[PDB]
Amino acid sequence: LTDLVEQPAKVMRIGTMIKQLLEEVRAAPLDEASRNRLRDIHATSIRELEDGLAPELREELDRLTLPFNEDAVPSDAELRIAQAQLVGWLEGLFHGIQTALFAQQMAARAQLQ
Amino acid sequence: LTDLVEQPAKVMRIGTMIKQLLEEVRAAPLDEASRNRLRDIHATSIRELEDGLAPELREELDRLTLPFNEDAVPSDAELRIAQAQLVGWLEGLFHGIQTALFAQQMAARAQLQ
Amino acid sequence: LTDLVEQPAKVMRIGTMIKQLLEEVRAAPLDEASRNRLRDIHATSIRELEDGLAPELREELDRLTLPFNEDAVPSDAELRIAQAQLVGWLEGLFHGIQTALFAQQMAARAQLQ
Amino acid sequence: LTDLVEQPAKVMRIGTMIKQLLEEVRAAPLDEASRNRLRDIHATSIRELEDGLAPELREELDRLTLPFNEDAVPSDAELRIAQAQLVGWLEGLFHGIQTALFAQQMAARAQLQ
Amino acid sequence: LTDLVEQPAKVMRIGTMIKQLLEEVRAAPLDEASRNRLRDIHATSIRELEDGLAPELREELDRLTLPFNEDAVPSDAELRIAQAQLVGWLEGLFHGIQTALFAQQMAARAQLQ
Amino acid sequence: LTDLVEQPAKVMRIGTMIKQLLEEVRAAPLDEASRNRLRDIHATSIRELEDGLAPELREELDRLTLPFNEDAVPSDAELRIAQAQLVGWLEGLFHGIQTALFAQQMAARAQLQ
Amino acid sequence: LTDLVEQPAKVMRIGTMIKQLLEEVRAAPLDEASRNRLRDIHATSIRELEDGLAPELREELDRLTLPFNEDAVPSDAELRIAQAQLVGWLEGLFHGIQTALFAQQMAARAQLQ
Amino acid sequence: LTDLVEQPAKVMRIGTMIKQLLEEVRAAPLDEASRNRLRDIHATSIRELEDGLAPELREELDRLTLPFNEDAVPSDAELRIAQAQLVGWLEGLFHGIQTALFAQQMAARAQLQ
Amino acid sequence: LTDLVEQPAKVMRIGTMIKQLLEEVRAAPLDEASRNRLRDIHATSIRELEDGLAPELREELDRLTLPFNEDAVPSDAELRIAQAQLVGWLEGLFHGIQTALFAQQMAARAQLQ
Amino acid sequence: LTDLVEQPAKVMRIGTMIKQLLEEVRAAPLDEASRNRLRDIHATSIRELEDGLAPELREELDRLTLPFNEDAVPSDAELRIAQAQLVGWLEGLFHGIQTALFAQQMAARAQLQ
Amino acid sequence: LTDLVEQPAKVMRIGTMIKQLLEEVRAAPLDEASRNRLRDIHATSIRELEDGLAPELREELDRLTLPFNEDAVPSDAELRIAQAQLVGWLEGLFHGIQTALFAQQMAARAQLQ
Amino acid sequence: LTDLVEQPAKVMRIGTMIKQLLEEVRAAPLDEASRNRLRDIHATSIRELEDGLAPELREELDRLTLPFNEDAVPSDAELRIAQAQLVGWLEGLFHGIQTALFAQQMAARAQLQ
Amino acid sequence: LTDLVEQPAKVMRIGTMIKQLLEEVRAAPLDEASRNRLRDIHATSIRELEDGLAPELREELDRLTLPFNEDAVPSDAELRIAQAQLVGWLEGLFHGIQTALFAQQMAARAQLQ
Amino acid sequence: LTDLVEQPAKVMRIGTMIKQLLEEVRAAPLDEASRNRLRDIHATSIRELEDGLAPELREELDRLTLPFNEDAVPSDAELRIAQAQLVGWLEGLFHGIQTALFAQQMAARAQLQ
Amino acid sequence: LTDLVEQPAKVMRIGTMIKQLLEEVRAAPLDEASRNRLRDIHATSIRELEDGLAPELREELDRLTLPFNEDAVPSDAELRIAQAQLVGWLEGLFHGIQTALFAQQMAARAQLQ
Amino acid sequence: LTDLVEQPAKVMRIGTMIKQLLEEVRAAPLDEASRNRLRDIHATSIRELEDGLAPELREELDRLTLPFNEDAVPSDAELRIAQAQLVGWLEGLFHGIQTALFAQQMAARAQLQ
């Protein structure tokens, strides 16, 4: 919990943002003005993600992630690869949270009966 | 918690507006006269959204959003990206509210039994 | 909650004490050695009760209650009267708690949906 | 919370012993040889109970309880008053424990959904 | 678990023996030939009980229990007090085991899903 | 586990015998001619019981049981004591066996899913 | 058992990431700039996976896995081969672990009844 | 159980690997770099498979299976044939395991009742 | 004589009654059922006393005596005080009788010689 | 004078019987089975006493005495009160008879000299 | 004389037996074999007493006494009550004999001079 | 008169023997080897007593006495009961004789004066 | 010549334009603003070429060429293919012109001598 | 001879076109949108080539060439194979033309001198 | 012919200026301040070119050229495209001039010899 | 001339074909779709080759050449071997022709001087 996510409300917030934008890249091809946007949004979403994570996960994210180069406009492929990577990493982080929340709840309910 | 959204009825209202307009750009391409409208609508929707958020979410919303180029009529791609960004940001905002609101309900209902 | 009972775990403890002691006077008549005990017990439960109640309820309990005389051995009637008076007052205090506890729950659970 | 009861398995063990022995004093009258036994059992049972309680509950248990007189064999009435007192005090202790432990189970299960 | 009971199968065995013998003393009065039996059985059952308990509980049982004098034939009262005392202590020990057994099962079942 | 009872069909058989005979002494008082029978029946039933038990339980049964005085025809009280002693010992024996027997089943049913 | 995976929350986290990225290579063909990303992500994902695995699983993971050739940009085929390999390898690991964890739940739940 | 598979957790792991890789060859045709990989993967999976099986199955797998040649790149047909051969053999091995596991469970639960 | 006691045989009768009852309260403490009796006895002994005394001594006794209240059970102290008061009053009344009886004898014995 | 007691041999007989039983209640505490005897003995002793007394002493004896409540077994305290009452009442009865009888003997011996 | 006792030599015989046996029950507590003895002696002693008394006293003794129930071993209390009851009744019968025997002697000695 | 005791020197002799042995059981508890002696002595002492009594006293003694169980060793209590029974019965026998012996002495001494 | 090219001065003009623009697409990658230009330029260069060619070559050029779709921005690849295609076709036209122009000169230079 | 090629200016023209396009596939890798063009261009180039070739060369060209598959977008390898095939086939065609054409020049110049 | 270019010295002058500026954009990337210059320079260079071309070339140049967007700063790519467009068009313009100017020089030299 | 090549223009055509295709296998690695093509091309080029050679060279070519198998895709090595084998054989065939063409010319040119 707190050992992983410092701001739980914020990580899901940005998490849903990254997810629905990912579902947009698949919907229709984009143009340079839109691909250039998602690059800026992906960079800012990670910067905003690290503010809500524990020190351990910040570094892990930096080891796994690859910031885009601001001199070349990425492709619809890169944007899908980069975004879905965060979507899976957050959903696996969240699935780790929900399994531990199950352990804490059932343990107190069993420590009572 | 509720310290995050000051005017819930006002925030969710505009959010539903951004959601249904997002479903329209998906349906069929638009013309220049309408894209300029959605651009104007996108700007005013954020302004009315900031009035209903806390200062912490205000700045965060501004750090994540991208103002349009006043001199160029954006494409259907930009408008889908900008709008879906807000739709995702708001759904993650609400999921943080309801998970804590449900947490409040099952804490008092259990503090009784 | 905080407006009435300061130490909830302590109040329902002593109450369940006084409750089961009341079921003993009904079970069989007592002798001087036991009546003198229940009076001594009844005094201490009230002193331990005032420590666990809010200032307003302390006075109300003091205005309603009648301390026993420490020179005459009370009857089985007084002990039933004195104790059952508290049992009803404690059950009425908790029913005041639980009616609001459901209000806190069913209102927060409804403020979400 | 569980800071109140240090050895729960031990506190409830001795409690169950005092409860069923109480069911014996009600079942049939006793003789001096058996009344003397319960007094000895009553003394050691509280000593073993205080070892399993927190210091605050020790004092409260000590402020509420009454050590027997070794010079007089108590009556079947005294032993019922003394024992049921602890039975009521012990059942009220757990009711404080189970209501908060039940609160832990539903609050964490709600912080997830 | 093992910190409390070394031979679980044996303690529930002797326990059911002590319980049904307790239910016989209540059924009809006994004679010196029968009262003398239960004393020897109660003495041997405790010796056989200590073989099946952990070192901590052996000591606790000796502190709570009172061995009979082999110079006077006890009463139907004494035999009921002695036996029911063991019955509650064993039933409270078992209720302590089963409450913790639920904690072990509901914790591994929750740490998995 | 089953290391305890060598002849399960035989141990449970004789047990039901003493159980139903226990229910007969309870129903009505007996005469010297039938008490002498029950004394003989109790002796032969233990002998037939040891053939179906493991050596550890053999001595334990011998440590717990009390052979009758062949001189005096025992009373309805002794016969209730001797018989109910075995009935409790046997019921506690079976619950220890089947509780582990259930453990074998649900462990394999869980090792499959 | 649990000694196999040292950091389950971390192993599964990275697992979900690799799984969803696999669903992206499948969705649409990629370009050379994005294929270079997935190769880099594949290398860092395994590096972070071995940190959360025991040495026995490491070597087994290392004996089974195939580092990419850096002088050549892999195909959309290779990236599917490599990733799906881990996804199956990771899903079988949990199914091997969780099936024994389920055995812990039903064996203790049966060791009680 | 013990007579067929020595390391059950490992065998269902690799099986779930080989299974999902089989679903990749069906999804799209492969290139020389990917076909060459799956062959290397298939060889290593059998080495990791033989380590986890009983000696009889080691030989049975060796009698049924056909190792690939390391000088020619196999076709999409061979790789489907080779892998699917193992998938059926692994699913058939487990159904032999699971059908007996129900026999062990449903028989011990019936030997108890 | 005639001016003091009208029925001397009756007063010495009741006096020995009230006297011997006084030696019982000193012998061992009493219970509510016996204290309630002695109160009833003390009143009836006084009513039967006034019937056997001259009018002057009646009123003297009424000025000296204090009737018990019939709604509260007196203490062993009151009962000791109340009865001993009569015993001293009767023995002083009798010592007045015997001193005059000797005066009648030795004066008539002196008129002769 | 002797008209007071109609059957002197019968009254004093029963009186001696009541006196020595009183010395038995003092010697050791009694049980419910023996207390019930003395209550019945107390009732029949008064009945046999009224047959040997004159009507004036009958009603006086009935006005002073208190019949026991057949619905409750009295205590050793009540039986001491009731019996000692009669012993004192009877000893005062004889002292009233013997003092006047001594007066008769010193009147005829003096009417001669 | 003959109006009351038919066999004077026999009544003082059995009387002494009943008296010294009474002094034994006080001396030390008894066992069932001894308590059962004294019941048989007390029953036969009354039977042997009735053979030596006049018809009037037979009936009075039967009205005063309470035969024991042969279907329960009396207590040390009952045997003391029953025996002491006869001891006083016999001592009061003899004191009635001695008071009249002196009257017969001193009257004939005075009818001579 | 002398028709009752045929051999006075023998009856009194053996009587003193039983008396002094009674004073020995009172002094200290006995062991099984000595209780068997006193039981044997009690049988022969009655046998030698009947030889010195008239047939009427033989049967009467037999109607009052209780033969011991040859197959069971009596307790310290029985021996006191049996012996004290004889001691009292013998003293009452002589006191009846001695009272008549004085009648022979004083009546003949008065026929002279 | 006249049968192939109507405006020779114009074709080598636009041809040189297409050639040097082709050398720019090779020189550095382009952006949507530049890729969009070359599409418009390539379309207008073909339109201006057909005005300068004979009817036979106009048709052949349209059969060989593929106009771009104005509703999508082409790649640096498409523009290179489209442009280079024209460059060779124009260079092949000129080599056909130059080979015949040498035939016109050399044949007349030989028709003279 | 010159009957081989009916339209020399046209065969060389298209030949130059295919040659320089080959120089583009070599220059940089292509994308699916451009690879699809070269397939379409390759088909129309052969169609325009046969119009300028003799029937013998048509079939020979048709016997040597390979029509593309509609479904698959060819690779940079296929397009290089297909195009270079024609360029080599065409350059060998011209070498057959020019070597005999040069033979005419030296034969007529020698038939004169 | 010369009817095409009215001011040859001016047409080539400005052309060389666009050519050498083109060699500068290739040399190093530019900044917004210089791109704004080249954009203005490109506009005036075409204006000064049209003054020196014939009306027919004015339109063709205008039909081929593309005015820049003055609300957006063009890229380094567009400027290379726009400039190279002119550089290619101008060299092709002169090659049409130079081929006819040389044609005049060989025609008069042949009309003389 | 006629002794070796029947259709010289055709053989140097296919040779220049086979030669230029060989320079492609060296240029970049191929895929299965291209390797399968070049094999098909190589087979048909030989069939077209045998049509253009003299019968002696046909058989020699068949003795030297090795036709490919049509069920396995050859390697880039085989394709380089197969074609280069022909290219050398063709260049050696042509170099023999040029030496004989040199023989025909120089011998006739010398027969003149």
Side-chain angles (χ1 to χ4, degrees), chain K residues 7 10-11 15 20 22 30 32-33 37 45 51 56 61 68 73 76 80 85 90 94 96-97 102 110:
Chain K
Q7 315 193 18
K10 180 172 178 171
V11 175
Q20 289 210 18
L22 175 67
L30 303 186
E32 276 191 358
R37 266 185 172 257
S45 60
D51 175 76
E56 256 199 5
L61 190 55
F68 281 108
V73 166
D76 288 30
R80 282 191 298 102
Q85 180 200 38
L90 294 182
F94 292 151
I97 292 182
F102 192 20

Side-chain angles (χ1 to χ4, degrees), chain N residues 22 26 60 63-64 66-68 75 77-78 80-82 84-85 87-89 91-93 95, chain P residues 9-10 12-13 16-17 20-21 24 27-31 33-34 37-38 40-41 44-45 48:
Chain N
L22 175 66
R26 194 185 301 259
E60 169 178 307
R63 295 194 300 261
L64 293 174
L66 318 155
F68 279 108
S75 63
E78 299 193 64
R80 284 191 301 103
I81 295 298
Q85 179 199 36
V87 180
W89 196 83
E91 287 192 1
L93 179 57
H95 196 269
Chain P
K10 179 174 177 171
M12 181 51 187
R13 192 185 315 116
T16 305
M17 192 191 60
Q20 290 211 19
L21 281 180
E24 284 288 357
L30 304 184
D31 63 334
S34 298
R37 269 183 172 230
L38 274 179
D40 290 339
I41 295 177
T44 304
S45 59
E48 294 285 328

Side-chain angles (χ1 to χ4, degrees), chain P residues 9-83:
Chain P
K10 179 174 177 171
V11 175
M12 181 51 187
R13 192 185 315 116
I14 300 161
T16 305
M17 192 191 60
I18 306 176
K19 188 182 174 56
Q20 290 211 19
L21 281 180
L22 173 64
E23 304 294 338
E24 284 288 357
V25 200
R26 295 197 193 101
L30 304 184
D31 63 334
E32 278 189 357
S34 298
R35 301 191 201 102
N36 209 93
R37 269 183 172 230
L38 274 179
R39 181 191 66 195
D40 290 339
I41 295 177
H42 177 246
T44 304
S45 59
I46 295 189
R47 290 183 176 182
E48 294 285 328
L49 271 169
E50 292 186 322
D51 176 77
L53 294 185
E56 256 199 6
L57 298 188
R58 285 179 187 169
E59 308 163 355
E60 167 178 305
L61 191 55
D62 189 28
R63 296 192 299 262
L64 294 173
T65 203
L66 318 156
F68 280 113
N69 53 338
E70 312 150 35
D71 295 327
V73 168
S75 63
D76 285 29
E78 299 193 65
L79 301 177
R80 282 186 297 102
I81 298 300
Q83 282 170 358

Side-chain angles (χ1 to χ4, degrees), chain M residues 26 60 63 80 91, chain N residues 13 20 24 31 37 48:
Chain M
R26 294 197 192 101
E60 168 179 306
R63 295 192 298 262
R80 283 190 299 103
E91 286 188 359
Chain N
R13 194 187 316 115
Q20 290 210 17
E24 287 289 358
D31 62 331
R37 266 185 172 258
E48 293 285 326

